[PDB]
Symmetry: C3
Subunit: 180 residues, 3 copies
Protein backbone atom coordinates (compact mmCIF):
# COMPACT_ATOMS: atom_id res chain seq x y z
CA UNK A 1 0.00 0.00 0.00
CA UNK A 2 0.90 3.70 -0.12
CA UNK A 3 2.37 5.77 2.72
CA UNK A 4 2.32 9.54 2.26
CA UNK A 5 5.37 11.50 3.35
CA UNK A 6 5.21 15.31 3.26
CA UNK A 7 8.39 17.38 2.80
CA UNK A 8 9.07 21.12 2.59
CA UNK A 9 12.01 22.23 0.47
CA UNK A 10 13.31 25.75 0.95
CA UNK A 11 16.12 27.76 -0.58
CA UNK A 12 17.34 29.74 2.45
CA UNK A 13 19.86 31.60 0.27
CA UNK A 14 22.81 30.18 2.20
CA UNK A 15 24.09 27.30 0.04
CA UNK A 16 25.21 29.25 -3.07
CA UNK A 17 22.30 27.60 -4.89
CA UNK A 18 21.23 27.27 -7.64
CA UNK A 19 23.93 27.59 -10.30
CA UNK A 20 22.38 28.57 -13.63
CA UNK A 21 24.57 27.49 -16.56
CA UNK A 22 23.32 29.18 -19.76
CA UNK A 23 24.54 26.47 -22.16
CA UNK A 24 21.40 26.53 -24.36
CA UNK A 25 22.92 29.66 -25.85
CA UNK A 26 19.62 31.15 -27.05
CA UNK A 27 19.44 34.96 -27.45
CA UNK A 28 16.59 37.47 -27.60
CA UNK A 29 16.29 39.47 -30.85
CA UNK A 30 17.16 43.15 -30.46
CA UNK A 31 18.57 42.87 -26.93
CA UNK A 32 20.78 39.77 -27.24
CA UNK A 33 19.64 38.84 -23.71
CA UNK A 34 19.85 35.24 -22.66
CA UNK A 35 16.68 33.30 -23.30
CA UNK A 36 16.05 30.12 -21.29
CA UNK A 37 16.16 27.19 -23.67
CA UNK A 38 16.88 23.52 -24.11
CA UNK A 39 20.29 22.74 -22.70
CA UNK A 40 20.66 25.34 -19.98
CA UNK A 41 21.75 23.28 -16.91
CA UNK A 42 21.00 23.96 -13.23
CA UNK A 43 22.82 22.18 -10.39
CA UNK A 44 21.13 22.89 -7.07
CA UNK A 45 20.84 21.98 -3.39
CA UNK A 46 18.23 23.24 -0.92
CA UNK A 47 17.23 22.43 2.69
CA UNK A 48 14.38 20.11 3.60
CA UNK A 49 12.07 20.05 6.60
CA UNK A 50 9.29 17.73 7.75
CA UNK A 51 5.59 18.39 7.13
CA UNK A 52 5.14 20.06 10.55
CA UNK A 53 8.00 22.48 9.73
CA UNK A 54 9.43 21.74 13.20
CA UNK A 55 12.29 19.46 12.10
CA UNK A 56 15.27 20.04 9.80
CA UNK A 57 15.66 16.77 7.92
CA UNK A 58 18.51 17.37 5.52
CA UNK A 59 18.96 18.67 1.96
CA UNK A 60 18.02 18.11 -1.66
CA UNK A 61 20.82 17.72 -4.19
CA UNK A 62 20.82 17.32 -7.95
CA UNK A 63 20.63 18.63 -11.48
CA UNK A 64 17.92 20.14 -13.68
CA UNK A 65 18.16 20.13 -17.47
CA UNK A 66 16.13 22.95 -19.05
CA UNK A 67 13.86 21.56 -21.80
CA UNK A 68 11.61 24.42 -22.94
CA UNK A 69 10.47 27.93 -22.08
CA UNK A 70 6.85 29.02 -22.27
CA UNK A 71 6.13 32.73 -22.80
CA UNK A 72 2.41 32.11 -22.32
CA UNK A 73 2.90 30.41 -18.93
CA UNK A 74 5.91 32.56 -17.93
CA UNK A 75 8.18 29.70 -16.92
CA UNK A 76 10.14 26.64 -17.88
CA UNK A 77 9.97 22.87 -18.16
CA UNK A 78 12.98 21.05 -16.76
CA UNK A 79 13.91 17.39 -16.63
CA UNK A 80 15.22 16.78 -13.13
CA UNK A 81 17.27 14.23 -11.23
CA UNK A 82 17.78 14.76 -7.54
CA UNK A 83 17.80 13.15 -4.13
CA UNK A 84 16.35 13.99 -0.73
CA UNK A 85 18.63 13.31 2.24
CA UNK A 86 17.07 12.66 5.65
CA UNK A 87 20.17 12.17 7.85
CA UNK A 88 20.34 8.68 9.33
CA UNK A 89 16.89 7.79 7.98
CA UNK A 90 18.43 7.50 4.49
CA UNK A 91 17.59 9.07 1.14
CA UNK A 92 14.97 9.05 -1.60
CA UNK A 93 15.89 9.58 -5.29
CA UNK A 94 13.56 11.11 -7.87
CA UNK A 95 13.51 11.58 -11.66
CA UNK A 96 11.07 13.44 -13.86
CA UNK A 97 9.42 16.75 -14.67
CA UNK A 98 10.08 19.96 -12.76
CA UNK A 99 7.83 22.72 -14.12
CA UNK A 100 8.30 26.21 -12.69
CA UNK A 101 4.68 27.24 -13.26
CA UNK A 102 2.67 24.16 -12.22
CA UNK A 103 2.59 20.97 -10.18
CA UNK A 104 4.02 17.72 -11.53
CA UNK A 105 4.65 14.08 -10.59
CA UNK A 106 8.17 12.71 -10.31
CA UNK A 107 9.13 9.03 -10.34
CA UNK A 108 10.50 7.73 -7.05
CA UNK A 109 13.47 5.79 -8.35
CA UNK A 110 14.52 4.21 -5.05
CA UNK A 111 16.17 5.01 -1.75
CA UNK A 112 18.32 3.86 1.13
CA UNK A 113 17.99 3.27 4.85
CA UNK A 114 14.33 3.21 5.87
CA UNK A 115 13.56 4.01 2.22
CA UNK A 116 15.54 1.09 0.74
CA UNK A 117 13.43 -0.56 -1.95
CA UNK A 118 10.90 2.26 -2.16
CA UNK A 119 9.01 3.04 -5.33
CA UNK A 120 6.06 5.08 -6.54
CA UNK A 121 5.53 8.73 -7.47
CA UNK A 122 5.95 12.10 -5.75
CA UNK A 123 3.86 15.22 -6.29
CA UNK A 124 5.88 18.45 -6.56
CA UNK A 125 3.90 21.55 -5.63
CA UNK A 126 5.39 25.00 -6.22
CA UNK A 127 4.50 27.15 -3.22
CA UNK A 128 6.48 30.16 -4.36
CA UNK A 129 8.91 29.32 -7.13
CA UNK A 130 11.88 29.04 -6.63
CA UNK A 131 12.21 29.51 -2.87
CA UNK A 132 9.57 27.17 -1.40
CA UNK A 133 8.35 23.78 -2.66
CA UNK A 134 6.17 21.08 -1.11
CA UNK A 135 6.29 17.35 -1.88
CA UNK A 136 3.93 14.50 -1.29
CA UNK A 137 5.83 11.21 -1.64
CA UNK A 138 3.42 8.34 -2.32
CA UNK A 139 5.78 5.71 -1.00
CA UNK A 140 5.36 2.03 -1.72
CA UNK A 141 7.45 -0.99 -0.78
CA UNK A 142 8.76 0.00 2.65
CA UNK A 143 8.01 -0.61 6.31
CA UNK A 144 5.85 1.76 8.34
CA UNK A 145 7.42 5.23 8.49
CA UNK A 146 8.59 6.42 11.93
CA UNK A 147 6.13 8.69 13.73
CA UNK A 148 8.67 11.54 13.67
CA UNK A 149 8.21 11.81 9.90
CA UNK A 150 4.39 11.75 10.12
CA UNK A 151 3.56 14.71 12.35
CA UNK A 152 0.46 16.77 11.44
CA UNK A 153 1.26 18.65 8.26
CA UNK A 154 1.24 22.45 7.97
CA UNK A 155 -0.84 23.41 4.91
CA UNK A 156 1.45 25.00 2.32
CA UNK A 157 1.17 28.71 1.49
CA UNK A 158 3.73 31.35 0.48
CA UNK A 159 4.18 32.62 4.05
CA UNK A 160 5.06 29.31 5.71
CA UNK A 161 8.52 28.96 7.26
CA UNK A 162 10.50 26.47 9.33
CA UNK A 163 10.21 26.91 13.09
CA UNK A 164 13.05 29.00 14.53
CA UNK A 165 14.39 25.94 16.35
CA UNK A 166 14.47 23.96 13.09
CA UNK A 167 16.15 26.78 11.14
CA UNK A 168 18.73 26.92 13.94
CA UNK A 169 19.17 23.11 13.92
CA UNK A 170 18.59 22.84 17.66
CA UNK A 171 18.05 19.71 19.75
CA UNK A 172 14.61 18.16 19.32
CA UNK A 173 14.34 19.86 15.92
CA UNK A 174 16.69 17.87 13.72
CA UNK A 175 16.67 14.41 12.14
CA UNK A 176 19.32 12.10 13.66
CA UNK A 177 22.59 13.24 12.04
CA UNK A 178 20.57 15.49 9.75
CA UNK A 179 22.22 16.04 6.39
CA UNK A 180 24.23 19.25 6.23
Amino acid sequence: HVQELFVYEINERDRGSPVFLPFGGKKQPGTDAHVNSLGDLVPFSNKIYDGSLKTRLGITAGLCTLISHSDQKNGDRYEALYSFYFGDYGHISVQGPYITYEDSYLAITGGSGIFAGCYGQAKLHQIIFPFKLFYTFYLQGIKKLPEALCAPCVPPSPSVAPADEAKQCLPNHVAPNFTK
Copy 2:
Protein backbone atom coordinates in the same frame (compact mmCIF):
# COMPACT_ATOMS: atom_id res chain seq x y z
CA HIS B 1 3.39 -10.05 -15.71
CA VAL B 2 5.08 -8.06 -18.43
CA GLN B 3 3.11 -5.65 -20.63
CA GLU B 4 4.72 -4.50 -23.85
CA LEU B 5 4.39 -0.85 -24.86
CA PHE B 6 5.71 0.30 -28.24
CA VAL B 7 6.75 3.91 -28.78
CA TYR B 8 8.22 5.83 -31.73
CA GLU B 9 10.61 8.70 -30.98
CA ILE B 10 11.12 11.18 -33.80
CA ASN B 11 13.29 14.27 -34.03
CA GLU B 12 11.22 16.49 -36.30
CA ARG B 13 13.91 19.21 -36.27
CA ASP B 14 11.46 21.71 -34.77
CA ARG B 15 12.73 21.84 -31.18
CA GLY B 16 16.41 22.97 -31.59
CA SER B 17 17.35 19.47 -30.37
CA PRO B 18 19.80 17.99 -29.64
CA VAL B 19 22.14 20.54 -28.09
CA PHE B 20 25.67 19.17 -28.41
CA LEU B 21 27.96 20.55 -25.70
CA PRO B 22 31.57 19.65 -26.59
CA PHE B 23 32.85 19.61 -23.02
CA GLY B 24 35.07 16.56 -23.57
CA GLY B 25 37.31 19.06 -25.39
CA LYS B 26 38.86 16.63 -27.87
CA LYS B 27 39.89 17.39 -31.45
CA GLN B 28 41.13 15.23 -34.32
CA PRO B 29 44.92 15.49 -34.74
CA GLY B 30 45.64 16.82 -38.20
CA THR B 31 42.20 18.38 -38.83
CA ASP B 32 40.96 19.81 -35.50
CA ALA B 33 37.42 18.44 -36.16
CA HIS B 34 35.59 17.65 -32.94
CA VAL B 35 36.27 14.18 -31.60
CA ASN B 36 33.44 12.74 -29.51
CA SER B 37 34.84 11.91 -26.09
CA LEU B 38 34.01 11.31 -22.44
CA GLY B 39 32.25 14.36 -21.06
CA ASP B 40 30.58 15.81 -24.12
CA LEU B 41 27.00 16.46 -22.88
CA VAL B 42 23.81 16.32 -24.91
CA PRO B 43 20.51 17.75 -23.61
CA PHE B 44 17.66 16.69 -25.91
CA SER B 45 13.91 16.48 -26.39
CA ASN B 46 12.05 14.73 -29.27
CA LYS B 47 8.43 13.93 -30.07
CA ILE B 48 6.87 10.58 -29.31
CA TYR B 49 4.04 8.76 -31.07
CA ASP B 50 2.23 5.50 -30.34
CA GLY B 51 3.14 2.18 -31.98
CA SER B 52 0.52 2.57 -34.75
CA LEU B 53 1.95 6.02 -35.55
CA LYS B 54 -1.60 7.43 -35.52
CA THR B 55 -1.36 9.32 -32.23
CA ARG B 56 0.98 12.03 -30.94
CA LEU B 57 1.62 11.08 -27.28
CA GLY B 58 4.07 13.73 -26.07
CA ILE B 59 7.83 14.12 -25.82
CA THR B 60 11.09 12.70 -24.56
CA ALA B 61 13.26 14.99 -22.43
CA GLY B 62 16.64 14.46 -20.83
CA LEU B 63 20.40 14.41 -20.92
CA CYS B 64 23.03 12.12 -22.44
CA THR B 65 26.63 11.97 -21.23
CA LEU B 66 29.06 10.84 -23.93
CA ILE B 67 31.25 8.02 -22.55
CA SER B 68 33.39 6.78 -25.43
CA HIS B 69 33.81 6.82 -29.17
CA SER B 70 34.63 3.76 -31.21
CA ASP B 71 36.40 4.31 -34.52
CA GLN B 72 35.98 0.58 -35.23
CA LYS B 73 32.20 0.56 -34.75
CA ASN B 74 31.81 4.13 -36.10
CA GLY B 75 29.75 5.35 -33.18
CA ASP B 76 29.50 6.29 -29.53
CA ARG B 77 28.44 5.02 -26.13
CA TYR B 78 26.31 7.45 -24.12
CA GLU B 79 24.92 7.18 -20.61
CA ALA B 80 21.35 8.46 -20.81
CA LEU B 81 18.87 9.86 -18.30
CA TYR B 82 15.51 10.79 -19.72
CA SER B 83 11.75 10.55 -19.49
CA PHE B 84 8.86 9.85 -21.84
CA TYR B 85 5.78 12.08 -21.41
CA PHE B 86 2.36 10.81 -22.44
CA GLY B 87 0.15 13.80 -21.57
CA ASP B 88 -2.51 12.82 -19.01
CA TYR B 89 -1.44 9.15 -18.92
CA GLY B 90 1.70 10.21 -17.03
CA HIS B 91 5.39 9.57 -17.64
CA ILE B 92 8.03 6.84 -17.69
CA SER B 93 11.62 7.48 -16.62
CA VAL B 94 14.65 5.54 -17.89
CA GLN B 95 18.39 5.26 -17.20
CA GLY B 96 21.11 3.40 -19.01
CA PRO B 97 22.99 3.02 -22.27
CA TYR B 98 22.39 4.61 -25.65
CA ILE B 99 24.83 3.16 -28.18
CA THR B 100 24.66 4.87 -31.56
CA TYR B 101 25.49 1.68 -33.52
CA GLU B 102 23.38 -1.05 -31.82
CA ASP B 103 20.29 -1.79 -29.74
CA SER B 104 20.48 -1.53 -25.96
CA TYR B 105 18.36 -2.08 -22.88
CA LEU B 106 17.51 0.74 -20.49
CA ALA B 107 16.35 0.45 -16.89
CA ILE B 108 12.79 1.62 -16.33
CA THR B 109 13.31 3.60 -13.13
CA GLY B 110 9.67 4.42 -12.47
CA GLY B 111 6.79 6.57 -13.63
CA SER B 112 3.67 8.55 -12.81
CA GLY B 113 -0.04 8.38 -13.55
CA ILE B 114 -0.91 5.03 -15.15
CA PHE B 115 2.81 4.23 -14.95
CA ALA B 116 3.15 4.93 -11.22
CA GLY B 117 5.19 2.09 -9.65
CA CYS B 118 6.37 0.69 -12.99
CA TYR B 119 9.63 -1.22 -13.34
CA GLY B 120 11.48 -3.39 -15.84
CA GLN B 121 13.62 -2.74 -18.87
CA ALA B 122 13.10 -1.06 -22.25
CA LYS B 123 14.67 -1.98 -25.59
CA LEU B 124 16.05 0.96 -27.56
CA HIS B 125 16.20 0.32 -31.30
CA GLN B 126 17.59 2.99 -33.56
CA ILE B 127 15.92 3.18 -36.96
CA ILE B 128 17.76 6.25 -38.33
CA PHE B 129 20.75 7.81 -36.54
CA PRO B 130 19.78 9.82 -34.45
CA PHE B 131 16.44 11.09 -35.76
CA LYS B 132 14.15 8.04 -35.46
CA LEU B 133 14.04 5.42 -32.69
CA PHE B 134 11.65 2.65 -31.64
CA TYR B 135 11.16 1.50 -28.06
CA THR B 136 9.72 -1.61 -26.52
CA PHE B 137 8.94 -1.03 -22.83
CA TYR B 138 8.66 -4.33 -20.93
CA LEU B 139 6.49 -2.86 -18.20
CA GLN B 140 5.92 -4.58 -14.85
CA GLY B 141 4.02 -3.50 -11.74
CA ILE B 142 1.11 -1.59 -13.31
CA LYS B 143 -2.57 -2.03 -14.22
CA LYS B 144 -3.63 -3.15 -17.71
CA LEU B 145 -2.58 -0.48 -20.21
CA PRO B 146 -5.33 1.47 -21.98
CA GLU B 147 -6.17 -0.03 -25.41
CA ALA B 148 -5.37 3.38 -26.95
CA LEU B 149 -1.69 2.76 -26.12
CA CYS B 150 -1.87 -0.81 -27.51
CA ALA B 151 -3.02 -0.32 -31.12
CA PRO B 152 -1.49 -2.70 -33.69
CA CYS B 153 2.13 -1.63 -34.17
CA VAL B 154 3.60 -0.35 -37.45
CA PRO B 155 6.69 -2.49 -38.13
CA PRO B 156 9.82 -0.35 -37.68
CA SER B 157 11.72 0.58 -40.85
CA PRO B 158 13.60 3.66 -42.14
CA SER B 159 10.61 5.07 -44.04
CA VAL B 160 7.97 4.94 -41.28
CA ALA B 161 6.32 8.25 -40.46
CA PRO B 162 3.57 9.56 -38.19
CA ALA B 163 0.13 9.97 -39.75
CA ASP B 164 -0.44 13.51 -41.07
CA GLU B 165 -3.17 14.15 -38.49
CA ALA B 166 -0.86 13.03 -35.67
CA LYS B 167 2.00 15.13 -37.00
CA GLN B 168 -0.44 18.09 -37.12
CA CYS B 169 -1.66 17.44 -33.55
CA LEU B 170 -5.32 17.39 -34.62
CA PRO B 171 -7.77 16.94 -31.70
CA ASN B 172 -8.64 13.25 -32.32
CA HIS B 173 -5.03 12.22 -33.02
CA VAL B 174 -3.36 13.21 -29.77
CA ALA B 175 -3.13 11.71 -26.29
CA PRO B 176 -5.35 13.49 -23.76
CA ASN B 177 -3.55 16.78 -23.04
CA PHE B 178 -0.53 15.47 -24.96
CA THR B 179 2.80 16.81 -23.79
CA LYS B 180 4.00 19.73 -25.94
Copy 3:
Protein backbone atom coordinates in the same frame (compact mmCIF):
# COMPACT_ATOMS: atom_id res chain seq x y z
CA HIS C 1 14.94 -11.57 -0.27
CA VAL C 2 18.35 -9.94 -0.79
CA GLN C 3 21.30 -11.15 -2.91
CA GLU C 4 24.71 -9.60 -2.27
CA LEU C 5 26.86 -8.73 -5.28
CA PHE C 6 30.41 -7.48 -4.70
CA VAL C 7 32.09 -5.26 -7.32
CA TYR C 8 35.49 -3.54 -7.44
CA GLU C 9 35.74 -0.29 -9.40
CA ILE C 10 39.21 0.82 -10.50
CA ASN C 11 40.39 3.92 -12.32
CA GLU C 12 43.32 2.51 -14.28
CA ARG C 13 44.13 5.94 -15.78
CA ASP C 14 43.62 4.73 -19.35
CA ARG C 15 40.13 6.07 -20.19
CA GLY C 16 40.82 9.83 -19.78
CA SER C 17 38.58 9.80 -16.72
CA PRO C 18 37.34 11.67 -14.80
CA VAL C 19 36.62 14.83 -16.79
CA PHE C 20 36.40 17.69 -14.31
CA LEU C 21 34.24 20.57 -15.56
CA PRO C 22 34.76 23.56 -13.21
CA PHE C 23 31.31 25.08 -13.83
CA GLY C 24 30.81 26.07 -10.16
CA GLY C 25 33.08 28.98 -11.09
CA LYS C 26 34.71 29.32 -7.67
CA LYS C 27 38.29 30.51 -7.33
CA GLN C 28 40.74 31.20 -4.50
CA PRO C 29 40.94 34.86 -3.28
CA GLY C 30 44.46 35.51 -4.63
CA THR C 31 45.52 32.46 -6.67
CA ASP C 32 42.43 32.14 -8.90
CA ALA C 33 43.03 28.40 -8.38
CA HIS C 34 39.97 26.16 -8.42
CA VAL C 35 37.77 25.69 -5.40
CA ASN C 36 35.35 22.76 -5.62
CA SER C 37 31.79 24.07 -5.38
CA LEU C 38 28.16 23.40 -6.26
CA GLY C 39 27.80 23.04 -10.00
CA ASP C 40 31.16 21.59 -10.94
CA LEU C 41 30.27 18.56 -13.12
CA VAL C 42 32.23 15.33 -13.46
CA PRO C 43 31.55 12.84 -16.29
CA PHE C 44 33.41 9.58 -15.60
CA SER C 45 33.95 5.96 -16.55
CA ASN C 46 36.06 3.34 -14.73
CA LYS C 47 36.67 -0.40 -15.01
CA ILE C 48 34.84 -2.96 -12.89
CA TYR C 49 35.98 -6.36 -11.66
CA ASP C 50 34.24 -9.13 -9.69
CA GLY C 51 34.60 -9.59 -5.92
CA SER C 52 37.35 -12.20 -6.34
CA LEU C 53 39.29 -9.71 -8.53
CA LYS C 54 39.88 -12.52 -11.05
CA THR C 55 37.41 -11.28 -13.68
CA ARG C 56 37.09 -8.04 -15.67
CA LEU C 57 33.32 -7.50 -15.86
CA GLY C 58 32.98 -4.18 -17.68
CA ILE C 59 32.81 -0.51 -16.80
CA THR C 60 30.99 2.17 -14.86
CA ALA C 61 29.68 5.20 -16.76
CA GLY C 62 27.93 8.35 -15.67
CA LEU C 63 27.93 11.85 -14.30
CA CYS C 64 28.50 13.42 -10.89
CA THR C 65 27.27 16.85 -9.83
CA LEU C 66 29.44 18.42 -7.12
CA ILE C 67 27.19 19.65 -4.28
CA SER C 68 29.48 20.91 -1.54
CA HIS C 69 33.07 20.97 -0.38
CA SER C 70 34.09 20.42 3.23
CA ASP C 71 37.36 21.95 4.42
CA GLN C 72 36.92 20.24 7.81
CA LYS C 73 36.51 16.79 6.24
CA ASN C 74 38.90 17.51 3.34
CA GLY C 75 36.47 16.27 0.70
CA ASP C 76 33.32 16.71 -1.34
CA ARG C 77 29.73 15.62 -1.59
CA TYR C 78 28.56 14.67 -5.07
CA GLU C 79 25.18 13.62 -6.41
CA ALA C 80 25.82 10.71 -8.75
CA LEU C 81 23.96 9.12 -11.65
CA TYR C 82 25.73 6.13 -13.19
CA SER C 83 25.45 2.58 -14.44
CA PHE C 84 27.53 -0.58 -14.03
CA TYR C 85 27.96 -2.63 -17.23
CA PHE C 86 28.59 -6.37 -16.91
CA GLY C 87 28.95 -7.35 -20.58
CA ASP C 88 26.27 -9.83 -21.64
CA TYR C 89 24.90 -10.15 -18.07
CA GLY C 90 23.31 -6.70 -18.39
CA HIS C 91 23.58 -3.50 -16.37
CA ILE C 92 22.60 -2.01 -13.03
CA SER C 93 21.75 1.70 -12.67
CA VAL C 94 22.26 3.72 -9.49
CA GLN C 95 21.40 7.18 -8.15
CA GLY C 96 22.51 8.87 -4.96
CA PRO C 97 25.40 10.25 -2.94
CA TYR C 98 29.14 9.87 -3.50
CA ILE C 99 31.04 11.44 -0.61
CA THR C 100 34.80 11.40 -1.07
CA TYR C 101 35.59 10.95 2.63
CA GLU C 102 33.04 8.33 3.80
CA ASP C 103 30.85 5.37 2.78
CA SER C 104 27.34 5.96 1.44
CA TYR C 105 24.31 4.08 0.10
CA LEU C 106 23.04 4.52 -3.44
CA ALA C 107 19.57 3.67 -4.73
CA ILE C 108 19.52 0.77 -7.20
CA THR C 109 17.15 2.28 -9.75
CA GLY C 110 16.86 -0.78 -11.99
CA GLY C 111 18.76 -2.81 -14.54
CA SER C 112 18.68 -5.03 -17.60
CA GLY C 113 19.50 -8.61 -18.52
CA ILE C 114 19.89 -10.75 -15.38
CA PHE C 115 19.32 -7.51 -13.45
CA ALA C 116 16.01 -6.59 -15.12
CA GLY C 117 13.54 -5.47 -12.44
CA CYS C 118 16.17 -5.16 -9.72
CA TYR C 119 15.75 -2.79 -6.80
CA GLY C 120 17.31 -2.04 -3.43
CA GLN C 121 20.39 -0.17 -2.26
CA ALA C 122 24.14 -0.43 -2.81
CA LYS C 123 26.91 0.39 -0.36
CA LEU C 124 29.77 2.45 -1.80
CA HIS C 125 33.05 2.01 0.11
CA GLN C 126 36.17 3.90 -0.87
CA ILE C 127 39.31 1.77 -0.84
CA ILE C 128 41.74 4.50 -1.82
CA PHE C 129 40.93 8.03 -2.94
CA PRO C 130 40.60 8.62 -5.77
CA PHE C 131 41.29 5.38 -7.71
CA LYS C 132 39.64 2.32 -6.08
CA LEU C 133 36.13 1.70 -4.75
CA PHE C 134 34.24 -1.39 -3.54
CA TYR C 135 30.49 -1.89 -3.82
CA THR C 136 28.02 -4.19 -2.14
CA PHE C 137 24.78 -4.34 -4.11
CA TYR C 138 21.88 -5.58 -1.96
CA LEU C 139 19.85 -6.79 -4.92
CA GLN C 140 16.16 -7.55 -4.66
CA GLY C 141 13.63 -8.71 -7.24
CA ILE C 142 15.81 -10.87 -9.49
CA LYS C 143 16.64 -14.53 -10.13
CA LYS C 144 19.56 -16.28 -8.42
CA LEU C 145 22.81 -14.68 -9.60
CA PRO C 146 25.12 -16.82 -11.73
CA GLU C 147 27.93 -18.51 -9.77
CA ALA C 148 30.57 -16.62 -11.78
CA LEU C 149 29.36 -13.37 -10.12
CA CYS C 150 29.34 -14.89 -6.61
CA ALA C 151 32.92 -16.12 -6.16
CA PRO C 152 34.59 -15.74 -2.73
CA CYS C 153 35.23 -12.03 -2.20
CA VAL C 154 38.68 -10.53 -1.66
CA PRO C 155 38.37 -8.54 1.60
CA PRO C 156 38.67 -4.85 0.71
CA SER C 157 41.93 -3.14 1.70
CA PRO C 158 44.19 -0.44 0.15
CA SER C 159 46.60 -2.93 -1.47
CA VAL C 160 44.04 -5.01 -3.41
CA ALA C 161 44.26 -5.01 -7.21
CA PRO C 162 42.91 -7.08 -10.12
CA ALA C 163 44.71 -10.29 -11.08
CA ASP C 164 47.16 -9.58 -13.93
CA GLU C 165 45.13 -11.92 -16.17
CA ALA C 166 41.95 -9.90 -15.52
CA LYS C 167 43.80 -6.63 -16.09
CA GLN C 168 45.05 -8.00 -19.42
CA CYS C 169 41.50 -9.20 -20.27
CA LEU C 170 42.72 -12.73 -20.93
CA PRO C 171 40.55 -15.81 -21.54
CA ASN C 172 38.95 -17.23 -18.40
CA HIS C 173 39.19 -13.75 -16.85
CA VAL C 174 36.48 -11.74 -18.59
CA ALA C 175 32.69 -11.57 -18.43
CA PRO C 176 30.96 -12.79 -21.63
CA ASN C 177 31.50 -9.95 -24.08
CA PHE C 178 32.74 -7.80 -21.18
CA THR C 179 31.95 -4.12 -21.63
CA LYS C 180 34.90 -2.19 -23.06
